Each structure stands twice: as C-alpha cells, then as structure tokens.
Swiss-Prot record:
It is found in: Host membrane; Virion membrane. Glycans are attached at N2, N11, N26, N65, N95, N100, N143. Inhibited by Zn(2+), which binds the catalytic site. It comes from Bovine viral diarrhea virus (strain CP7) (BVDV). This is E(rns) glycoprotein. Initial binding to target cell probably involves interaction of E(rns) with glycosaminoglycans. Also possesses intrinsic ribonuclease (RNase) activity that can inhibit the production of type I interferon and assist in the development of persistent infections. The active site is at H74, E75, K78, H79. The chain holds residues 271 to 431 of 3907 of the full protein. Heavily glycosylated. Homodimer; disulfide-linked.
Amino acid sequence: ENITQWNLQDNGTEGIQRAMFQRGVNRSLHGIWPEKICTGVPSHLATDTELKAIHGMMDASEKTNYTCCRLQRHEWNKHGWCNWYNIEPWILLMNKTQANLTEGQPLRECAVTCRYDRDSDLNVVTQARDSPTPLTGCKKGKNFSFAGILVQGPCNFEIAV
Ligand SMILES: *[C@@H]1O[C@H](CO)[C@@H](O[C@@H]2O[C@H](CO)[C@@H](O[C@@H]3O[C@H](CO[C@@H]4O[C@H](CO)[C@@H](O)[C@H](O)[C@@H]4O)[C@@H](O)[C@H](O[C@H]4O[C@H](CO)[C@@H](O)[C@H](O)[C@@H]4O)[C@@H]3O)[C@H](O)[C@H]2NC(C)=O)[C@H](O)[C@H]1NC(C)=O
Ligand SMILES: *[C@@H]1O[C@H](CO)[C@@H](O[C@@H]2O[C@H](CO)[C@@H](O[C@@H]3O[C@H](CO[C@@H]4O[C@H](CO)[C@@H](O)[C@H](O)[C@@H]4O)[C@@H](O)[C@H](O[C@H]4O[C@H](CO)[C@@H](O)[C@H](O)[C@@H]4O)[C@@H]3O)[C@H](O)[C@H]2NC(C)=O)[C@H](O)[C@H]1NC(C)=O
Ligand SMILES: *[C@@H]1O[C@H](CO)[C@@H](O[C@@H]2O[C@H](CO)[C@@H](O)[C@H](O)[C@H]2NC(C)=O)[C@H](O)[C@H]1NC(C)=O
Ligand SMILES: *[C@@H]1O[C@H](CO)[C@@H](O[C@@H]2O[C@H](CO)[C@@H](O)[C@H](O)[C@H]2NC(C)=O)[C@H](O)[C@H]1NC(C)=O
Ligand SMILES: O=c1ccn([C@@H]2O[C@H](COP(=O)(O)O)[C@@H](O)[C@H]2O)c(=O)[nH]1
Ligand SMILES: O=c1ccn([C@@H]2O[C@H](COP(=O)(O)O)[C@@H](O)[C@H]2O)c(=O)[nH]1
Ligand SMILES: *[C@@H]1O[C@H](CO)[C@@H](O)[C@H](O)[C@H]1NC(C)=O
C-alpha cells in the first residue's frame, strides 16, 4: 500500500513550511509512495507543463521560490514512472490528492516530523501522512498542532481502534 505524505505550514521551520505560512497554504503534498523505488532511465521525462498540472503542490526548493518543479520531478523520477508507467494517471492522482488536502484536515492525518514550540508548549507538525509511523522531533507528552488544529495524540483517529 501507498504512503501519502505532505508538508504542513510552520513559520518556525525554514524552507517550504515557512513559504507555506507566508502564502496561507496549510497542506502541500510531498509524495505518494509505493514500496518500489525507481532506478535507471525514466520511461518519460516529466515536463514543467505536465508537473504544473498538480495544482497547489509546492516545490520544496528555494530555487523556484517554493513553486514548481524540482520536488514534483524528483517524485516522478524516484517514485512515479516505474510504478504508474504513464504520467497522465500519475498527475491525476497527485492533483486529486492535493485537491483533497487543500479542503482541510484529512480523515487520517498522522504526524511524521515536528518542531516542538517551547512558547506554545506544542508539537507543531511539519510533515504528516495517512498512517502512523515512528516520530522525529515530537516531544513526548505534548499536544500536536497540525497547521493550527490541536490534536492530543500523533493521529486524529485511534490506532488501537
Ligand atoms: C516568522 O519567522 C521568522 C523567522 O524566525 C521571524 O523573523 C524574525 O523576526 C525577528 C523579529 O522581527 C528578527 O529579529 C531581529 O533580528 C535583527 C537581525 O537580523 C539579522 O539579519 C538577518 C537578515 O539578513 C536575519 O534573518 C537574521 O536573524 C540576523 O540576525 C536584529 O537586529 C533585531 O533586533 C532589534 O529588534 C528587537 C525587537 O524586535 C530589539 O529588542 C533589539 O534591541 C533590536 O533593536 C531583531 O532581533 C529575526 O531576524 C527574523 N528572522 C528571520 C530569519 O527572518 C518572523 O518574525 C516570523 N513571522 C511572524 C509573522 O511571526
Ligand atoms: C498505489 O500505487 C500503485 C503503484 O505502485 C498504483 O497502481 C498503478 O495504478 C496505475 C493507474 O493509476 C496503473 O497504470 C496503468 O497501467 C496499465 C498497465 O498495467 C498492467 O497491469 C498491471 C497491474 O495490474 C501492471 O503491473 C503491468 O505492468 C501491466 O502493464 C496501463 O496500460 C495504463 O495506461 C493506459 O492508460 C493511461 C491513462 O490512464 C494512458 O496514458 C496510457 O497510454 C494507457 O492507455 C496505466 O499506466 C498501474 O498499472 C498501477 N501499478 C501497479 C504496479 O499496480 C495504485 O493505483 C496506487 N493506489 C492508490 C490507492 O494510491
Ligand atoms: C479524495 O476524497 C474523496 C472523498 O473522501 C475520495 O473518494 C472516496 O473514494 C472511496 C473509494 O476509494 C469511495 O468509497 C467513496 O465513496 C469516495 N467518496 C466520495 C465522496 O466520492 C477519494 O478517494 C480521494 N482521492 C484521493 C486520490 O485521495
Ligand atoms: C488553514 O487552517 C486554519 C486552521 O484550521 C484555518 O483557520 C480557521 O478558519 C476558520 C474559518 O475561516 C475559523 O473559524 C477558525 O477560527 C480558524 N482556525 C484557526 C486556528 O485559525 C484556515 O482557514 C485554513 N486555511 C485555508 C486556506 O484553508
Ligand atoms: O518536501 C520536503 C522536502 C524537504 N524537506 C526538508 O528539507 C530537508 C533537506 O533538503 P533536501 O535534502 O530535500 O534537498 C529535509 O531533510 C527536510 O528537513 C521538507 O520538509 N519537505
Ligand atoms: O516510503 C518512504 C519514502 C520516503 N520517506 C521519507 O521522506 C523523505 C523523502 O522521500 P522522497 O520523496 O525524496 O523519496 C525522506 O526523508 C524519506 O526518509 C519515507 O519515510 N518513506
Ligand atoms: C486538479 O485539481 C483541481 C482542484 O485543485 C481541479 O479544479 C482540476 O479539475 C484538477 N485537474 C484535473 C482533474 O486535471
């Protein structure tokens, strides 16, 4: 099964999370990851015109001012081509995932990486995914802030349940 992961806004974290805060973006798709990682010559080189059709996904690179298409192309190259075989169904899934993320807090949202904010005493979530996973930078016993939404645990749904 595919892991869907995304970035969340945080002015306290340099890079994409800061660029997101400035542009009023809450969630920005990082990738959709099957188990197979692509290696070798891609079956199609992704174009800027193709990658821009993933609406609302922000590049993690400062060089494009956090727009398009360094991260988008990296994702196609490392996780896309050998798994989707054709760019069209891949762009459509990526664009639809971002459209869903743009609507707000997803049904399943689990913290991946945090920046613990001493001032607010919160785990400000900087990256999240649709399934639970071991945490990075999340302070034990502290509540979680997912682009402004306060959650008591790492997920917004019970994982025992
Ligand atoms: C979003 O997040 C960013 C990053 O943390 C915040 O930006 C910081 O804001 C503070 C407060 O305005 C800045 O502090 C001031 O730094 C001055 C020196 O800055 C240097 O220059 C580079 C730019 O080339 C900075 O990026 C570096 O940080 C350098 O250190 C410093 O001179 C200044 O002091 C003066 O003001 C204070 C009061 O604010 C006085 O008490 C003091 O005596 C003196 O007069 C500040 O300390 C900080 O530099 C900014 N950081 C960055 C990386 O940009 C934003 O505030 C956050 N935005 C929101 C909306 O919350
Ligand atoms: C989770 O991630 C996996 C990838 O690991 C996704 O599965 C891929 O889904 C895409 C569709 O979104 C599939 O692409 C289509 O593949 C057709 C050929 O596939 C054959 O069948 C098996 C799978 O049962 C493959 O493994 C073989 O290699 C076979 O070749 C292909 O013909 C088709 O292209 C046609 O349509 C497109 C437009 O839709 C045209 O552009 C094109 O010219 C052509 O007419 C698609 O490329 C892909 O096969 C799937 N890969 C695997 C390994 O299963 C899941 O969908 C993801 N699921 C979720 C929920 O995220
Ligand atoms: C975007 O969100 C919609 C709505 O939650 C998802 O659509 C659901 O898909 C499942 C099957 O995967 C259906 O059983 C539901 O009926 C659908 N709901 C609606 C309201 O259409 C969709 O899968 C999401 N897309 C992606 C790519 O994440
Ligand atoms: C980004 O997320 C924040 C936090 O959930 C959203 O802000 C909420 O917006 C509603 C309606 O505007 C207010 O009633 C709430 O008080 C807000 N919550 C907080 C904590 O500020 C914001 O709307 C989202 N932005 C986008 C573009 O979807
Ligand atoms: O979508 C992204 C890509 C990168 N990073 C951050 O930027 C760091 C390094 O930049 P790079 O190795 O991707 O070039 C990553 O380890 C992570 O801390 C993100 O938060 N989101
Ligand atoms: O299945 C995956 C793929 C990637 N990552 C993490 O996401 C970041 C970038 O993945 P990538 O999209 O560049 O491959 C890396 O820190 C990597 O550890 C995962 O946790 N699981
Ligand atoms: C991409 O998603 C947007 C919503 O963010 C939607 O308006 C558009 O139709 C989608 N593009 C497609 C389906 O090619």
